[PDB]
Ligand binder design. Sequence first.
Ligand code: ZN
Ligand code: ZN
Ligand code: ZN
Ligand code: ZN
Lengths: 75, 75
Amino acid sequence: SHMCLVCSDEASGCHYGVLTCGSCKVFFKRAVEGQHNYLCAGRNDCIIDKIRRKNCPACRYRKCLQAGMNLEARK
Amino acid sequence: SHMCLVCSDEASGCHYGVLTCGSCKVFFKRAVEGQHNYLCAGRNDCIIDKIRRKNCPACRYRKCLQAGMNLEARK
DNA sequence: TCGGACAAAATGTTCT
DNA sequence: AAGAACATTTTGTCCG
Ligand SMILES: [Zn+2]
Ligand SMILES: [Zn+2]
Ligand SMILES: [Zn+2]
Ligand SMILES: [Zn+2]
């Protein structure tokens, strides 16, 4: 009820359509708006938790999108 | 040879006993001088190349050790 | 070579 | 729920 759905950290509230923490909220906006081409170094199935969420932006971003995060969600 | 044995970027010379780039040189020094309680988000065999070497410090440090890097290489 | 200082990228928190 | 500003962590380059 107060776990980030992306990294399981303590969730602040609902951001861009999904219960997430502050760090995943800002990560998501940066991933969408910025140009990076994230690439997984594993098997496209990395564990994303409070510690490990720094280790694979590709899998973190993929999880944000799959949980349904969207920038224009207030519309 | 002219390629870093850890990440396959252009090597800048032989550092801590091994042909490596400057980024792997300082990454290793920082890991050995400091803490290196890193956690892999995959299965401890992450691919370490020029872009993905940022992803997993745990597997990067393992690759430095496996290549034989050591601080007292000189003396 | 090795390492300090500087610089940049990447991530996270506070405040409105 | 959203985003600007700041702060920290992590990484990489220069060394007129
Ligand atoms: Zn999160
Ligand atoms: Zn991954
Ligand atoms: Zn390297
Ligand atoms: Zn790994």
